[PDB]
Paper text:
Peptidyl-prolyl isomerases (PPIases) catalyze intrinsically slow and often rate-limiting isomerization of prolyl-peptide bonds in unfolded or partially folded proteins, thereby speeding up the folding process and preventing misfolding. An example of such a protein is [name] (Sensitive to Lysis D), which consists of an [name] type PPIase domain and a chaperone domain, called IF (insert-in-flap) domain, that has been shown to exhibit chaperone activity. Each of these domains contains one binding site for unfolded proteins or peptides. Often, FKBPs are linked to an additional chaperone domain that can increase their PPIase activity by up to 200-fold.
We measured the rate of prolyl isomerization in the presence of wild-type [name] (SlyDWT) and a construct lacking the IF chaperone domain ([name]ΔIF). In contrast, the activity of [name]ΔIF on the peptide carrying the mutation [name] is increased. The crystal structure of [name]ΔIF complexed with the [name] substrate offers hints to an additional feature of the chaperone domain that could contribute to increased activity. In this structure, the PPIase domain architecture is well conserved (RMSD of Cα of the core [name] domain of SlyDWT—residues 1–57 and 126–150—and [name]ΔIF is 0.80 Å), but the peptide [name] is bound in an inverse direction. We could model 14 residues of the substrate peptide that displays an opposite directionality compared with SlyDWT. However, this peptide binding mode is not possible in case of the peptide [name] in SlyDWT because the bulky side chain of the tryptophan in position 4 of the peptide would sterically clash with the β8-β9 hairpin of the chaperone domain. In our structures described here, we have observed the same substrate bound now in two different orientations in the absence and in the presence of the chaperone domain, implying that the chaperone domain binding provides directionality for substrate binding in the PPIase domain thereby leading to increased activity, by preventing unproductive binding. First, the chaperone domain can contribute to the directionality of the substrate binding in the PPIase domain, as is apparent from our crystal structures of a peptide substrate bound in a reverse direction in the absence of chaperon domain.
Numbering used by the authors:
A (entry chain A): 1 to 65, 69 to 102
B (entry chain C): 1 to 14
């Protein structure tokens, strides 16, 4: 399936800034409800399960930046769409993905 | 590595 409005999407992600790996992990989210940092779900829009790609979010637009992240820097995400599925009644009711 | 000031990332803040 394609990432779209009201789908529950599972991604694997790696966060780098200027070539330095800062974080890695996996998450699930309900698409179309501003649940991720600005720019990331827009990069995910329309993608199929199994797609791997990069997304770039200005660090300013996320609340994380007293750090190793320079101001005006870019957050480079390497993202892989692991699974896309229909949301359950619970998930649609609350606007968030559930385990 | 996650830290307090960026704990939600890449989920939206708040
Ligand atoms: Cl969510």
């Amino acid at each position: 399936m394609k990432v779209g409005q009201d789908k529950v999407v599972t991604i694997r992600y790696t966060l780098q800034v200027e070539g330095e790996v800062l974080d890695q992990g996996e998450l699930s989210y309900l698409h179309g409800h501003r649940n991720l940092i600005p720019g990331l779900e827009e990069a995910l829009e329309g993608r199929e399960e199994g797609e791997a790609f990069q997304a770039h979010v200005p660090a300013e637009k996320a609340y994380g930046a007293p750090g190793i992240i320079p101001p005006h820097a870019t957050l480079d995400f390497q993202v892989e769409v692991v699974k896309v599925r229909e949301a359950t009644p619970e998930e649609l009711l609350h606007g968030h993905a559930h385990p | 590595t996650r830290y307090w000031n960026a704990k939600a990332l890449p989920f939206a803040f708040g």
